[PDB]
From TrEMBL, chains A, B:
The keyword Hydrolase applies. It comes from Lactiplantibacillus plantarum (strain ATCC BAA-793 / NCIMB 8826 / WCFS1) (Lactobacillus plantarum). This is Beta-galactosidase. Its EC number is 3.2.1.21. Belongs to the glycosyl hydrolase 1 family. GO terms for biological process: carbohydrate catabolic process. Keywords: Glycosidase, Hydrolase. GO terms for cellular component: cytosol. InterPro entries: GH, Glyco_hydro_1. One of its GO terms (molecular function) is beta-glucosidase activity.
C-alpha cells in the first residue's frame, strides 16, 4: 500500500552525550559542566552522568535495537571522551577502546554504523580558553579530532557526518539560552555559524584526503524545516523570506552548493554583523561540499511580521525580522508543544530535488516525544505507543510521495532507538522504540519496535 | 674481497653476571641464589661468584679487548648491584662507582660503550616478594632502576639496550626449567612475555624523556632465527608458522611495529591463555618503539608438526603446535650438537629490510663455543682457534650478502670478547677471542683475536 525503494535504509538515531553516561570520561563538555554547577536547570536534577547507561550495556542494547528492526544506527563520538590533549589531539586510550567496542559490536549485530562527530558537546575547557566556536583555532582542533576518528575507525565505518544540527549550537549557545554558556549575542552568533560551516568543510576535505574505499562518504545533518508565512500580507511574506534564508540556507547552501546565500550576506552586511571570512577559507568551503545530506524534521516553522520595526533601537538578533506564528486548527504534539505537519516531508524532498542537485539524502531524524508512557503499559510492561506508529505512518506516507516524485531519499532514521537523555528535559518526554526504565536501566521493546521490524521486512506498510 | 660499509662497528658482547663476579654485591639475582643453594646444578661446580674477575681486573681486561680489535663492547649493568632499595631505586654508592670506573676505562681504551640493562638477572628478592616478572609492580621497579642508569651514565653512553632476549627469560623461568625459579606453567609464561615487552616500551619512553643528545638511542636484543618448515606439507608449514610468530613476532612486532601479532593473539585467545593487558599499556607499547635492533644468531631453527593433536588433553604450552626437526644431511658442529647454516643471517637481513622498515640494526651476538681449548694451545701458549675464524668468515660472508641486497646492518658483535661464565654450562664451552684460565684469572689473546683486529683495520676479508 505504501512501498519504498530497494535498498532503503531503516535506522535509528541517538548521540553519545545522551546515551553513554559520563563513566570514566576524561573531560566535561558544556552540558556536563552545566549540570555539575546548576543541576536545578535539568528536569528533576537528572543530568547526563548515567543517561541510558550505554557505556556499560552497549552489547545488549545493540541486540535490542537489532530486535527492533534497526538496520543502521547513527550515534556520535564525544570529543571529550576520545581526546586526551585537545591541542595535539592525543588519544585517551580507554576512550578509543570504548568506541572500537561499540563499532565492533554494531557489526556483530549486523547494524551498519553511521558515525557523527559532534552533537552539542563542545569541551567546556575550550570555551573557557578560547570562547569555543568563536575561535578559528578551536575549528582547527576540531579537524584534528576528526582526523583521528577517521584513522581509528575508518577501516570499518563507511558513513560519516561532521555535525548534528550546527544551527542548534548557534541558537543554543549564543542566541536563546538553550545551551551553556547561554550567551545572548547576535553578532557572535553570526561568526559562530560561519566558523562551524568552515569546520565542516575543513573536515570534509581531510576526510577525502584520508579515504581508501569508494563507498566511504561524509555528510552533514541539518533542520530543513520550511518557513510558512502566516498570510500573504507583504510583511508576513518578507518575514518568511528572511526566516528561510537564516534558518535553512545559512547551512544548506555552503554545505551543498559551496557558497553562502547571496541575499543573506547582503542583509548581514547592511546590518553590520557580517562574519569575518578570508578568501582562503571561502575557497575551502567552495571546494569541499558534503557527499550527502541528513534531514532532521519534526515540526513546521510558521512566521509573521515582527511586532516592532527592525529599525528600532535594539540589539541585533535574527529575530528582529520575524516572529513565530501559531496557526488555528494546527495538529499538536501537546505534551511537548510542537505542531504535527507531515506534508513538510514532501516539500523538503521536492526542494532538495529541484534546488540542491537531488543530492543523496536521508531522513536522519523523525520522532515523537511523549510524557508519562507508564500509563500506556499493558500486562507485560509493553508500551502501547500506537500514537508513535500512526505518527510514523503519516510522515512516511508524505516521504513516499516525495520519492515517487523523484527525490533521491535513501533512508529513514527514527529518533530514537532507546529512550535517551533529552538535555534539560532529561527523560520527561520519551522518543524511543525501546523504553528505558532509568532507575534500573532495564529496557523493553515498545509496540512500535515490532511494527518497525516488520516495516523493514516488507520495505513498506 | 668481502668488504663492509664505511663506519661498520666491529665489537664484542658479554654481560655483567657472566663476567664481574659477586665481589661486594649487595643483592642476589636468581642465578646467585640458585648457585648458592644448588651448586650441583652448575658445570664443574663453578658458579657466578668469581666468573671472569671483571670486578677486579676490568682495566687491563679492557686493554686486552682493545688489542683484540673490539671497537665497541656490549655488556650489562646488574640491577642487584646498582640498587640499594628496589622500591625507590635508591643507589648503592660502591656499585655506582664501579660502573663509572668501567665506563671511563672503556673510553680511556677507545672502546665505545654499549650498555644493556638486563641479562637474565632478576633480583631474587623480587621473585620471593612479587613473583618477579609476573608483577606489573616489578615492571615499574625496573623502570626506576633504568631511569637511574640513564641519569648516572647517560652523559658518556650513547648506545643502550633494554633487554637481552626476554624470550630466554620466559622460556627459562616459566617453560623448560633452565632458570631458577624453574616454574613450568604456559599461561604464566604468556603473561611474563607480555609484561617484559611492556617493561621495554616504558623504558624506551623514560629514555627519550631524559635524552639530551640526538645520538642517544635505545634498542632491544632479540633472537630472530627463522623457523624453517621440515617440508612443504601443510601440517609442517602450519607448525613453522606458529613457531615463527611465537618465537620471533611475540617480541619483534611490539618492539619495532608497536603492536602484537594479530594471528598470535587470536590463537592465545581461542586457547584461553591470552595475557592480561589494558588499553593504556597497549598505547604505551604502540607509542614507544625501539630505535634499533640487536640480532643474536648462533644456529638454525627447524620445525615439524606436533606428534599428537594440539586438541589433546594436556597442559597448554607453545610446543603443542610444533616440534623440533633434525634435517638429514645437515652440516654439523658435532661436538656442540649444533647445525651450521650461515645463510640464516641472510634470511634475517632480508626480513628486517622488507617487513620491519629496514630499521637500523646490528648483529649483537654471533660466536662459536668449543670445549677443551687446551688441545689447541701452541708453544707460545696461544689458542689456535682456526675453527673460530672460518665460522666468522662464513657468517660474515652471509651477512655481507644481506648488506649488499640493501639491509641496514651497521655492526657485528662477537660473542664473546673474553671467555665468560655461561650460566649452568659455566666454562665448559669457550666462546671468546681471548682465553681465560679461570683458576688464575690470567687472560690470553687467541689466534682469532689478531684476525678480528686485522678484520676491522680491513673492514672485510
Amino acid at each position: 500500500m505504501v512501498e519504498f525503494p530497494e535498498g532503503f535504509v531503516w535506522g535509528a538515531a541517538t548521540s553519545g552525550p545522551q546515551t553513554e553516561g559520563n563513566f570514566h570520561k576524561q573531560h566535561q563538555n558544556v552540558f556536563d559542566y552545566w549540570f555539575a554547577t546548576e543541576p536545578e536547570q535539568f528536569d528533576a536534577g537528572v543530568g547526563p552522568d548515567t543517561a541510558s547507561n550505554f557505556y556499560n550495556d552497549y552489547d545488549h542494547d545493540l541486540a535490542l535495537m537489532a530486535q527492533a528492526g534497526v538496520q543502521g544506527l547513527r550515534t556520535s563520538i564525544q570529543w571529550t571522551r576520545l581526546i586526551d590533549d585537545f591541542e595535539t589531539a592525543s588519544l585517551n586510550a580507554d576512550g578509543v577502546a570504548f568506541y572500537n567496542h561499540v563499532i565492533d559490536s554494531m557489526l556483530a549485530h549486523h547494524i551498519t554504523p553511521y558515525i557523527n562527530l559532534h552533537h552539542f558537546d563542545l569541551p567546556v575547557a575550550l570555551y573557557d580558553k578560547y570562547h569555543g566556536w568563536e575561535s578559528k583555532h578551536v575549528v582547527e582542533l576540531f579537524v584534528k579530532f576528526a582526523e583521528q576518528c577517521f584513522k581509528l575507525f575508518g577501516d570499518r565505518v563507511d558513513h560519516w557526518y561532521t555535525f548534528n544540527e550546527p544551527k542548534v549550537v548557534v541558537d543554543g549557545q549564543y542566541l536563546y539560552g538553550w545551551h551553556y554558556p547561554q550567551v545572548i549575542n547576535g553578532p557572535k552568533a553570526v561568526q559562530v555559524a560561519y566558523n562551524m560551516n568552515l569546520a565542516s568543510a575543513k573536515t570534509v576535505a581531510r576526510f577525502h584526503e584520508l579515504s581508501v574505499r569508494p563507498e566511504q562518504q561524509i555528510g552533514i545533518i541539518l533542520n530543513l524545516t520550511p518557513a510558512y508565512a502566516a498570510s500573504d500580507d507583504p510583511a508576513d511574506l518578507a518575514a518568511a523570506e528572511f526566516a528561510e534564508l537564516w534558518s535553512n540556507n545559512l547551512f544548506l547552501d555552503p554545505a551543498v552548493l559551496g557558497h553562502f546565500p547571496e541575499k543573506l550576506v547582503e542583509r548581514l552586511t547592511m546590518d553590520g554583523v557580517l562574519w569575518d571570512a578570508t578568501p582562503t577559507e571561502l575557497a575551502i568551503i567552495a571546494a569541499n561540499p558534503v557527499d550527502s545530506l541528513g534531514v532532521n524534521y519534526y515540526h513546521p516553522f510558521r512566521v509573521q511580521r515582527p511586532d516592532i520595526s527592525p529599525k528600532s533601537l535594539q540589539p541585533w538578533m535574527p529575530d528582529i525580522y520575524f516572529k513565530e506564528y501559531d496557526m488555528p486548527g494546527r495538529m499538536m504534539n501537546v505534551d511537548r508543544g510542537w505542531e504535527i505537519y507531515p506534508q513538510a516531508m514532501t516539500d523538503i524532498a521536492r526542494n532538495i530535488q529541484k534546488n540542491y542537485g537531488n543530492i543523496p539524502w536521508m531522513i536522519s531524524e523523525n520522532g515523537m516525544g511523549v510524557a508519562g508512557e507508564e500509563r500506556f503499559l499493558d500486562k507485560q510492561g509493553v508500551v502501547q505507543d500506537d500514537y508513535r506508529i500512526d505518527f510514523m505512518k503519516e510522515h512516511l506516507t508524505a516521504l513516499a510521495k516525495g520519492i515517487a516524485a523523484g527525490s533521491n531519499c535513501q533512508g529513514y532514521f527514527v529518533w530514537s532507538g532507546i529512550d535517551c537523555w533529552s538535555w534539560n528535559h532529561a527523560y520527561h518526554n520519551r522518543y524511543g522504540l525501546i523504553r528505558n526504565d532509568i532507575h534500573t536501566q532495564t529496557k523493553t521493546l515498545k509496540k512500535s519496535a515490532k511494527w518497525f521490524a516488520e516495516l523493514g521486512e516488507r520495505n513498506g506498510f
